[PDB]
Amino acid sequence: GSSGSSGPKKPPMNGYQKFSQELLSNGELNHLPLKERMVEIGSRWQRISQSQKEHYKKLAEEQQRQYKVHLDLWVKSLSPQDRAAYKEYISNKRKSGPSSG
Numbered sequence: 001g002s003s004g005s006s007g008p009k010k011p012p013m014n015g016y017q018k019f020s021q022e023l024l025s026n027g028e029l030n031h032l033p034l035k036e037r038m039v040e041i042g043s044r045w046q047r048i049s050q051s052q053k054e055h056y057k058k059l060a061e062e063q064q065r066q067y068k069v070h071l072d073l074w075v076k077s078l079s080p081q082d083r084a085a086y087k088e089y090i091s092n093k094r095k096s097g098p099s100s101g
Helices: 016-026 034-045 050-077 082-092
Strands: none
Touching: 016 034, 016 050
16 A cells, blocks of 8 residues: 655656556556566557557657656745755756856
């Protein structure tokens, strides 16, 4: 059991991971061990049609899109002490872009 973990959730990449996560969150193959689950999944994924994969693939794009802002939304919540830290890593990483006018 469990309740809540973090704002954004590690989204998929291609799309196959999307459908899987579903079978992992659904519990359709909760009768077998993870091992089987996975393999079992890969199979089920090999059953669906292009559409499905395509759909899940499209979603992945949206999921990864939302997770982007979500990260910020989670920041907007980050206290003045936490955010002060999180940012510490932000500035460090990437390279803010200046402006002229």
